[PDB]
Amino acid sequence: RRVVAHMPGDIIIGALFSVHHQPTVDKVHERKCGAVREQYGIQRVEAMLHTLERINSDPTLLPNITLGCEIRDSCWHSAVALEQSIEFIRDSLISSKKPIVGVIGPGSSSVAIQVQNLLQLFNIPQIAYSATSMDLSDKTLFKYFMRVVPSDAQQARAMVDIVKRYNWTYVSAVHTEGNYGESGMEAFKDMSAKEGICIAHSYKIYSNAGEQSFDKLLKKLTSHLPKARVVACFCEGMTVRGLLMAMRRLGLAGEFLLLGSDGWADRYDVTDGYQREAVGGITIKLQSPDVKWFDDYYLKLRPETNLRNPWFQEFWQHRFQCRLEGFPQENSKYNKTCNSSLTLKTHHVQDSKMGFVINAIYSMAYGLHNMQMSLCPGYAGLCDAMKPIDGRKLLESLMKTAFTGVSGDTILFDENGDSPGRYEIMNFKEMGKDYFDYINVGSWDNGELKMDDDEVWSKKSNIIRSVCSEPCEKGQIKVIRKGEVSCCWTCTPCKENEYVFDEYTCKACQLGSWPTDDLTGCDLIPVQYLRWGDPEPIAAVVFACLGLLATLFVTVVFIIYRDTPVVKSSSRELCYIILAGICLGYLCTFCLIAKPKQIYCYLQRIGIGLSPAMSYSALVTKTNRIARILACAQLVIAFILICIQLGIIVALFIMEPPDIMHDYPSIREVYLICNTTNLGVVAPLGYNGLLILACTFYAFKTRNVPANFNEAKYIAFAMYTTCIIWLAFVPIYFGSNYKAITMCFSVSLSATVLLGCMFVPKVYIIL
Amino acid sequence: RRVVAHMPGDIIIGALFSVHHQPTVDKVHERKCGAVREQYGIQRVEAMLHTLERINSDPTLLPNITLGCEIRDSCWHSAVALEQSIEFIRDSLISSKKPIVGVIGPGSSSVAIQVQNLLQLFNIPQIAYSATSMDLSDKTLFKYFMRVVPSDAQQARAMVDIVKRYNWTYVSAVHTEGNYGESGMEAFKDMSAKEGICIAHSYKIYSNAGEQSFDKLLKKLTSHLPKARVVACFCEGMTVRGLLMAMRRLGLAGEFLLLGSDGWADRYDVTDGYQREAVGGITIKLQSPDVKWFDDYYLKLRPETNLRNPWFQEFWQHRFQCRLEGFPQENSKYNKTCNSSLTLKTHHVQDSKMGFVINAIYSMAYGLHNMQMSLCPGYAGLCDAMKPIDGRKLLESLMKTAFTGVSGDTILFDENGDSPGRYEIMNFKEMGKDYFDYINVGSWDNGELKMDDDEVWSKKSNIIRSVCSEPCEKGQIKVIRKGEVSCCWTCTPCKENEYVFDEYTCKACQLGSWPTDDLTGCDLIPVQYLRWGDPEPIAAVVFACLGLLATLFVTVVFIIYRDTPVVKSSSRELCYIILAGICLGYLCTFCLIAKPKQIYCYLQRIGIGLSPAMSYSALVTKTNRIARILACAQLVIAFILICIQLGIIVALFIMEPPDIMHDYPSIREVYLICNTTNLGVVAPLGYNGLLILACTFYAFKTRNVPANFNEAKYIAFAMYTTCIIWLAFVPIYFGSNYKAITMCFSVSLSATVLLGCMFVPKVYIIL
């Protein structure tokens, strides 16, 4: 029964426009709707009527095709829209009074969803101009749905893009609870993980929550205020006003950067009285090019002339509160009559989604045109393959369609039947006096963000990067995981020996290698040289040189005077073995102090093994001779004893072959030593000790022999001193790391005491 | 325009019955349906007409309420059903010619789903009588849906229940591919995991697959034929025929137990010609009580009398291929006329879902009655709160409704708007000759399965339990995981020392504990006793006794004759120390061989430490005396030497305090020994060795002293033998576990050789 605005045509596009207000709870079953909507309603019906006239008058597309329409009141309520959609469907069915080819979707998403659920069963393509819910992106559930508006998912995309632009990490996130805000925050946090942006706490409040509730929410948000300053509300306007109430009450303004979605977009009524409260906030609007087409088509519309629109007349009486008695719709509500002088241009503000409506209409027109060109390239009108027009092929054409819209830019439909995003970023800035207002600060389009950074803050004193992680020191400071968020670093330095393995992971490289200046990596420290002017090495060298000079002098003296009683007092043949042993022992000091080559690794051990063994073998033979007392015999004994230690050295070579060892006293210290282990040093020392104990046993028996001018007494004393020195320096050797120096001093002083205690009396006597 | 069977009433229940056949592809847009369905169609319209008359005539419920109906052709096709549903909805809307309160759902599930998608938007409760798809169980998607039939999920439940009853694990599973079979197999495998039933391989074929494809499927199934014998097909009849073609071709019958869902339920046409092919198969049907109500209401229906049903007349001409020229529906298709004598009782077979239709009708009637009683307990007719009847409250009543159905049992609606399952299990058994047919073998109801096991196989020679895991041996056989399925055990035995920790997991308990007979657990083996009649212990005891007798005799003899030259030859005072040492050493043997008590742990070590040390201390003093040669002095030396070893024992007690050790030579052997470690045995042995070496050194000097009638020579020889024995038995001690026995023999023989070599000559001389 309800009146339908019917424009005649050949291919007939239906539409649902929210002409009347939502009926209250009392008339949900009767379904008597409220007052006529001005901005959302009749503007749109006039829009499509004029648009269809223009398309009818445009030879550019659909040449011999006339497009009619039916406008049915949608009342912004699901029930009424469903009634009207039923009327559409039955008309189309009984047609098979004319079949509806497609339909322009209702405003609200919560209504468009149900209308889609109904239309999906009859292959009726629907195009929406206001449905922005992202649950309509599915094609499993809503196959026949087309949007010239981007979903709220793309609002979330724009917000995350601008946050990325301003380089923030630890931002707070609140959202209105319901269909809108909840899903919006889900999308936002979905697209946050792809950017590494952290979220403080996904707070969730109503628009009807108490002032106390709002204050509690503000306190909860401010709990992390020092760290988190940018609060993204996927918020309704009333939520914004609630938060502003809370901010004025708590007085915690300034740090709270209110980044809002399409809530307080341009709606200053949201923030009237609270201009100072939320200055510097960032919001988003849909791009709405003011279309002059409708301005010209609409401002010249008088009630009498505009006969085609049925309720328009009625609208007049409500628009101006005047009762046009002359007009058939002589409503008794208004007292005064309507003056002919009263025009419509006054207070004329067109809807904020006018571009979208026109875009949807052209979208369907171009869909039909594309399908016509695909299937009817013959007759300029309706071909054979179009007479039973089917929704499947029309939707197929509509998926793969594009054109320049009335707005100015192109309209593309992706896989999910969504137009690309087209947003304007705006800031609630303050003027000179208390006249704060909204100003455009750039645009967001299809992914590319063109913001005007210089416009906001007017300087480089913006809100600090809300982050839980200050940039770590490039030296050794490594990130940690506090377990709270994914961007809360405690830049604790790595170990002195560690390097920067990763940004979040630290490691220390292999032994010997030490990190660089900035711990970029690590490098191997040079090995020790062991030929130095160090006091201890030079002291050893001086001692060895003095010993060599003394040995050479005494050797020469004893070789020349080989018949004197003083020389005859001792073995005039076996002393050469002593001299050779002593000289080799002295040269051992020089052997150790050099570059520790493989050949040197051989020679050093060879010398330090042979020379002491040889010397003490001669000593033990001499002591045995003395014991016999109180010479082609003892030579063989001495040779065998020397060969014993030579065999020991050979066996040690066989067991553990020498190689140039990179000795590591620490990990930050690298020295170069041969592979002489504990066994490799003890074994020669063991044999030397055995010979020394033998000498001690065979000489202690003759501790008090003053023969040859007090010879044996001083020899015994010196040997006791030598034994004491050996037993004292063995632990000093093992309890230190200056191994080469210790061996040098030990052998040098051993030979020195021996030579200086057995030969100095002899030299003094002879000269 | 399409003719609607309209029964007048006050509360009007619509219905959709598949009156005509599905229109072919050529007339999907024209929507001209095919021939009139007999079994599925007009039976049901007559059913509901008579049922509504009866409910109208029953004062038991809805006293002053008359129920009308509209029957609209459903044509088994989605498009026609949607057209008719649109008509219903528009009638109901314009009513607000009379409002439809509810609707009886279309037959097919693929049609009921779409009709539900349409009706959900208008609060129109729908009850289905044939929709068995389990995607309709959801209430998120299909809120206003009621089923008097159970879903296919419950067919899967029944199959899994019977498999559980017959106790099978490793069963093959095949399913028709599509809406039916795929979802059915999903449900079956869902409910299999709750029972631990394994699946061979979820094979998936069409009903249109080639004979080659069917043969390939049969080969794939038979690939596991020895292990898996029961093949559950959630199968269409054509799939069954395909599998039977394959079975006849391959000739792999017998082992293949065809457990089928509602495919070849009673449809012998599926298995005609293949009676021998799939004997012994198990199938399921919906319980269909043959309702005599409809039999009486329907058999007395003549075309002329039955004016209320519009197409019934037409049905007549198609039912009998006679053209009733007299009747207004004088179809020209049939040549012959209709004889008045021609009745309808011939070949009368009612539909297999008659009970379900009547149950649905009564279900809606009882829903209305319950809601009436809930809201209108006043006027016997329509109260105030019912005039604008709403679907929400009607569905609320329908959810919480129950009654005794026409079938005989109750109808309950759970949370998901589903009636409980009611199935009859049937077997394709063989008669005497080649006359194999279906026979009922029990029922399944709401969860309780009442099968007739004795009916099937007629003996205990059923199909073997198709399992991958034979029952493991109760001893130590543990299950494994081959990685193929969750019930493929290889009953490998556990370790000899292991126990049955779990059915699938094995473990071995703590040390010492050994498993029981059946490895139920483990128990601690008793410790060693070490007081035995074993040959070696008894030999030690005999030796010790002989030694004690000899020692006592010689002690007495030497005490009496304490002045003889033979006795005077040795120390006539120090020999008492020797005798006491020897006797204590002998008693050590008895000390070791007993229960190893804590006090015994003390005493044994004390003795074995003191006695040898004391004896050898006296020996070393004697040897020192001899060395002085070649007495209140040596007594103190001996006492000090004894106290040395006593202090050694005390220090060993301090370091490692004795405790009763459960010694474990192996894990299956438990002995009881003190905590005498290597150190605790070597230290006394070390001291003993030191004294022995001292004795050797001091006696080897006097190896050839024939004084006192060849005394020292034999003593030296015996001491050499003793040293050899010690050096030989130390490794024998360390290279064995008979520690107590070894110590006993060592000490006993040491004392024996000592006594028998130092004293036997003396005794022989004196007597």
Ligand SMILES: N[C@](CC1c2ccccc2Oc2ccccc21)(C(=O)O)[C@H]1C[C@@H]1C(=O)O
């Ligand atoms: N964009 C709207 C608005 C929208 C929204 C989207 C989804 C769910 C709820 C919901 O309600 C709110 C609340 C606050 C801000 C914007 C929205 C749409 O419905 O698509 C737009 C037609 C609606 C209009 O202009 O009134």
Ligand SMILES: N[C@](CC1c2ccccc2Oc2ccccc21)(C(=O)O)[C@H]1C[C@@H]1C(=O)O
């Ligand atoms: N039980 C049915 C039957 C059914 C089924 C269920 C779901 C999807 C497909 C489908 O097709 C098959 C194929 C073989 C066996 C049974 C089914 C139902 O549609 O509910 C029953 C009304 C259908 C009838 O009697 O024809």
Ligand SMILES: *[C@@H]1O[C@H](CO)[C@@H](O)[C@H](O)[C@H]1NC(C)=O
């Ligand atoms: C982070 O943002 C700042 C401006 O706030 C700017 O330096 C740049 O966009 C980002 N930083 C770097 C190092 O690129």
Ligand SMILES: *[C@@H]1O[C@H](CO)[C@@H](O)[C@H](O)[C@H]1NC(C)=O
């Ligand atoms: C497994 O099934 C068999 C009959 O096939 C029967 O023993 C019983 O139901 C099950 N087994 C046991 C041990 O209960």
